[PDB]
Design a protein around this nucleic acid. Sequence first.
RNA 1: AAAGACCAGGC
Lengths: 42, 49, 528, 34, 48, 44, 115, 67, 98, 257, 526
Amino acid sequence: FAKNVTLGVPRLKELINISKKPKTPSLTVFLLGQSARDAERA
Amino acid sequence: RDGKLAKPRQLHNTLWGMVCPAETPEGHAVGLVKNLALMAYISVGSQPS
Amino acid sequence: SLKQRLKGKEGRVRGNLMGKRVDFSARTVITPDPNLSIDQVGVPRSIAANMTFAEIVTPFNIDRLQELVRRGNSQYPGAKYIIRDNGDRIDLRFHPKPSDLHLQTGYKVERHMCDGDIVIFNRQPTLHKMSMMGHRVRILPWSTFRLNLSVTTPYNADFDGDEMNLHLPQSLETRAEIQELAMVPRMIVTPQSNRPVMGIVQDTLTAVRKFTKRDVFLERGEVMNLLMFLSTWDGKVPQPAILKPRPLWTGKQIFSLIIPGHINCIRTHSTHPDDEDSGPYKHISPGDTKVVVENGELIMGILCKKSLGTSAGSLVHISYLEMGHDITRLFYSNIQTVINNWLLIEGHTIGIGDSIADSKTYQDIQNTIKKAKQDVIEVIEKAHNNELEPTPGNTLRQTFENQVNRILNDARDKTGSSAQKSLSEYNNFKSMVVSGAKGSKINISQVIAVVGQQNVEGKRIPFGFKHRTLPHFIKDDYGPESRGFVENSYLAGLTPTEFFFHAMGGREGLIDTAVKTAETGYIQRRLI
Amino acid sequence: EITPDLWQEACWIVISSYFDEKGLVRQQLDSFDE
Amino acid sequence: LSEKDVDPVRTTSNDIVEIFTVLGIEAVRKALERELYHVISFDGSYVN
Amino acid sequence: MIYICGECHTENEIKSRDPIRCRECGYRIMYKKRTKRLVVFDAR
Amino acid sequence: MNAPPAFESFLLFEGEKKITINKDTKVPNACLFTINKEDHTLGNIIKSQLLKDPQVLFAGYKVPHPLEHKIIIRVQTTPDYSPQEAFTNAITDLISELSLLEERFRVAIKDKQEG
Amino acid sequence: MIIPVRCFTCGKIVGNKWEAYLGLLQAEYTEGDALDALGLKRYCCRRMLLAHVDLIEKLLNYAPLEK
Amino acid sequence: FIGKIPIMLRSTYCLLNGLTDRDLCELNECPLDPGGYFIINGSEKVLIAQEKMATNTVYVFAKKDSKYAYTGECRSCLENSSRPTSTIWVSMLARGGQ
Amino acid sequence: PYANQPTVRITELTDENVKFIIENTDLAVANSIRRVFIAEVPIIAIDWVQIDANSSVLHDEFIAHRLGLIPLISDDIVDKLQYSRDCTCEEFCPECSVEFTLDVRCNEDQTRHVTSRDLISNSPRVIPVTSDDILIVKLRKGQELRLRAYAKKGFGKEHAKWNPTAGVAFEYDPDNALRHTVYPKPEEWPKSEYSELDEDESQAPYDPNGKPERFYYNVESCGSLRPETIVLSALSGLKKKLSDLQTQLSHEIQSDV
Amino acid sequence: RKLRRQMDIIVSEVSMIRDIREREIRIYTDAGRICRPLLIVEKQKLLLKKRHIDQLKEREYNNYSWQDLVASGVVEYIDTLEEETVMLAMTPDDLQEKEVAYCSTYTHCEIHPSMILGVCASIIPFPDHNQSPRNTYQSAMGKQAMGVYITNFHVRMDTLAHVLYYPQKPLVTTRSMEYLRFRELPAGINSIVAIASYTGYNQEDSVIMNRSAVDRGFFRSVFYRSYKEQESKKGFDQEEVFEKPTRETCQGMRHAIYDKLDDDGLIAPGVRVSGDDVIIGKTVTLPTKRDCSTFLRTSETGIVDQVMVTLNQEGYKFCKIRVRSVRIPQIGDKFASRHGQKGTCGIQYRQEDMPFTCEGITPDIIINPHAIPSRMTIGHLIECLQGKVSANKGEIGDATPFNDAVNVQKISNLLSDYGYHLRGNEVLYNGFTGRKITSQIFIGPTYYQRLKHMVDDKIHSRARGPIQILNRQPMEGRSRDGGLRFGEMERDCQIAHGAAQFLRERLFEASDPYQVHVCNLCGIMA
RNA sequence: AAAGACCAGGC
Ligand SMILES: [Mg+2]
Ligand SMILES: [Zn+2]
Ligand SMILES: [Zn+2]
Ligand SMILES: [Zn+2]
Ligand SMILES: [Zn+2]
């Protein structure tokens, strides 16, 4: 330290240990059709 | 001192005039060892009769 | 128990097999020495007298080693022990021992460490392999290790109570191996980030910046004095840039002699605006920024951390890649010596006058701070009467805090820009920042204009007391002063509440530095 | 009967009186006395 | 990923275990490289 | 062997393997009476 | 314990020569003067007195390391004029200058006192 | 402890100027005027007397090891 | 006689209590010495104040992963007359069904 | 290729100060003459200290250090006196050293000031600058101090106790006309004592052809050597060093050729 | 509140709290609560009036002290959880008087804001102009500053007693340092400090000291070390005794010199002792004799200051010996300002070599300007300016943290009133060539303190010395002539080099080598 | 004195 993701040493530790439960597991999503451009379908 | 909890070590608003903010040892004991302010006085105790 | 003996740190395996205490190792305080070479390390006489390197007597060196034996252990350039063929060890410290001073080929004589010896130099928060490099011994008076300041960066050392280990290889095989693998010139460029690790840093960098400008002009005697500190100088004095009415050389002209061989490199000075490359004067550079080094000659530009520093494509990186480690070592040393000896002429400093702006600038900064306070008060009042709409994904408190933080950050950035715009070309803070030796623009902003918002755990100063930061403030006060925004600057001095809030802010950095190191070290050990 | 613009003298006078009366280790001395 | 109108090629997550269970081991290799690169170069540093 | 006292500062004669007891003072602390052999100090 | 004796900036112990001349092979008729146990007081003095000579092309002094007491003076002259002769002439020039200055200062002090 | 002779920066004798400085301070003069009357024009000299503290008086309170 | 108690220097029961500067100098003691330390086997020992939670008051804390959603505790001691402390917890069983 | 002719005028000359201006000379020679004032001027100061009894609250080498810094009048006999290293005799002899004897015991209750007056020398020429009194140590009742000291001949290179001078004020180009230093704001810099320009203007106009000359001096003696003897012996010592260098150079040239 | 103010039933220590929103009233008489005094405000005016200050000015011979001030209902001891319910004013002359309305219900006013600092942080001049981490560093470093720690040090014989020759009270001081008794026992000395890059030997955090000043006693100190010894009877016929052993009467004997010992085996004070010298002659009667004498630590080369003999608790003969060694600041010693500007001594130039002002002033310490811009010590520059103005004016500068009456502009104008540049800059001449330095150097007297950390006590060298009893590896520590440790990270770094046999030497040959005979059929030693 | 613990401190 509004998406918040662990960075720095704790994130490196999580990646190295492959923690089964990361502190802030996030999943970015991309849209194929008109929902990508139009805000209502998004 | 080995504890990685960074919360107790932090300088609190509650320490104003009570404990010196700047003065503290360096190393594993940062914040966990505090030296008294100039005007700070410790209550000695009294019977509440 | 036996299991406790065979355990982790201080156990048998980790504490006596993977790592162990070694003979032939010395440690003392380090001290800067610009007059030493890059690969050279200053060694006190007592350490060299105690430290011994075993040498095998041959008909080539029988006379010199016999002389060293005759000197004994009293005089420094001597030997402490003699080892015969059968392995019996002879001590020259006790009594003259006249019958045993005879030397014949095949014996081992343990002479004291001398100049040119090969040693491993270590400072041991060893993160990467450059934290331990082989050095060349030069004996100096007094009692501290001395090493060149470009070598400072790989070791991460600073000359304040720092201590470094000195390991002396005891065999010819390991000595040659350290010479051909771990020497300081051989490790200028890292495999970690394919950049040079050593770079012209601090005093020599600032003086390079002040010496590379068009403004500098050097007379005859100053040119001679600078030229003799160039070790690779061919002995031909270059024709001065100005011949009439009087012969005046230029800083770039003399610096071009330092650049080895025929090095071609193009860089940009930190001051370089982005408008120059688009419009005219692209190759003329009215501010003399950008860098062009053609045929090993500095044609134009100002040198800074972007050119001589530790960065990809830097001038020193090009020197290492095109020429080689040996010549780049001399390039480093010549830069250091000649530039320090020119700063002996020009001089550098920092003072109170360097940390104050014009009265108009102070008035502008005060007006900006007042406007910021008015805007944040208006935002607080608007949130109070519920006109503040919540930004999606954020609660009303989150949006209010975001608005306040944006206002305060914009105010601080504007004040910093105004303060940096007010610095004269002679200002020493600006001279240090543009050179990249030390400091930054935010540092000048904090010194001159505004310290800025103080944050604890990434948020504005919390309510340690009951809905108030300090007893001096009213309850539920979200204003900039109450929540930790420091209006004053370091030059002006912080108010007591601002002083306490700044103490809280610095406590965060102190705790992070003290607490992250253990976990980082554990991560490094696991990876290794 | 007030102290305007003379505060710098008065505050340090009362601080000096405090430190002459109590000292620096007064907390230790009082704790052991109790 | 199974959901309609969600791009199946570019959608990804920062955690590694579910990538291992869903997309395989080479996808884990690539995603772990991406996560390490992000956490290293976020501050602006560069590692070869 | 002469020791000078820490309270009354009157020199007393006492050999080894005898208890430390200052005469006419009642003190238990003795001192060594700086030696007679002379050392050279430079003025630097 | 490693502090050198105070008398190592002026005292010459056994073995070292006060001055040493080594010719410079990089350029013609240029020599290298090495003065042992001596510092800027005369390094600068011969450096500046050499520059007065129109027949000297290069002239200077340097200290290889402040912790050591040594001066390296490099002199390059015009052909048919040895740098050793220039260095000797500069030293004699400085001797004459100092003698004249001492005489003038004695005259000035005699004028100032009861005058 | 005691007033150091030979002011560190330049070398001017100030070991003899302590008692006179104390007298001038005790009778009329302020520190600036007392230092001026002692002929200390360079502030490196004036810092020697002005910032000096004389523990030699405190050390003399204790009884000598020998009477 | 049941034992000897070390005496903090310059306290009320110390022999240096109430002595003037000259009296302290006659005792080869520094008048500026604040005291407040014990002399144990010749060495000078100073007791450092130790922090601890205030006793006999009610506190409420919330743990992130405990089975308790909100936990109230009272570290209780009786006039410091006897026993170190007897502490009691009153908590709420989160949300997961029992 | 020959000497420029220097001229000297003496502005102020007292028993503790001499103020002179050196003209028509080079910058390096002025600087070297300034440095010889501090470094190369011979002087007599206490070096060898032996203490018989030291009851003072100051330990032995503390009072020895204080004794060594005591200035001694060497206006005349410093030249005839030889360095102890070059002296034929072992240890010290009157032709290489001066003996000082100190003997003070405090009997009265009031504190006794052991001063430079209490130092007793065998020869009357070297008095510790007492024709107030330099304080060595203070003694309470019952304390005693007896020591024997030898004073040697040395110069400022060896130790600062052999510095014959106080702060030597050197200055050239008072109104900055050579632009050796550039004032970022010339108007806020105080004008020097030797400044020759009017009050309204700040710096003299830049002189491209100028070279440093008219080097203003201010030599303040520490009381050991009277201030004019300091500069005279400085010039003599610099000339002697140059002559010795000349002799060694000539020998080297004959040897190598 | 009235009863506590007049101290009839409730002592001033007891704390009373009213939590209005939660309807609780808490009265605490417990021990261990932390409290500080605060002035009492009634309406918008202090209860501290002119008469209280008038009576406190005459505090001597008046029997009117702090206790009578507290008993008058003027000052009150407010602890923390009562401070929660209090509303404080920073200063009375600013926050009590009518202005743009912020608060009108002030109940207490702070004595002085500088009282929030501790003992070590109070000596910092202008601490509000510094970066807080640097204030922390200076606070933790002032405990290591060297000076006269106590006035009776001559009679106390304790190990590692560091004493400075000429401590000075700072030119720029805080009002609290008077109450810290720092004036009477200073730790450090003011020094003319030039912030410049002269020869590059002060780069990083290093400093350049003036060799002439150091020779004049600048930062010169003394180092006392105490040696205790206990003669005792342990065995039936086994006993210990102080005496000077002869060449052949004892079985154990070291090649150290014993001739300095007296008849009782104790060296009288005034005898110079170097490394390996025997301090106390002590032997053990073996059930002929065994020498257990104590030697000096290696290469101290000191002079025996004091030797005291007495009886211990058991009545056995007991000896303590103190040896002093005067240590001149070398180019390895550690020096710091009062702002966390720590650093080692780069090199010591004589007065000739150091740059000089037009008045002949040569800085005693030159620090690199590169330290200042990054770590934010502006109070260092302000302290330097204030020292420069105070040494000229003749006053001792006032550096109370929160004055608001001492601006940088005010100090600048005061300095300009004395013929110097208003910003403290001074034109400097090169020490070597005599040429004017093009930049104008910032010069002024700044308080500097010598630190305990000194190179002579830190330098170590090892070459085949003592080995451990169990691992047969080099010992641990400098005092035991132990070898340096080649830790795990060291071998990993060497593996990165691909330096196989250098690692083999470091971990097998330089350290413990050994040979074992192992069977060929079984893999076990034979 | 030996290894054990504790403490303080430097980077
Ligand atoms: Mg460091
Ligand atoms: Zn007695
Ligand atoms: Zn002075
Ligand atoms: Zn003789
Ligand atoms: Zn077998």
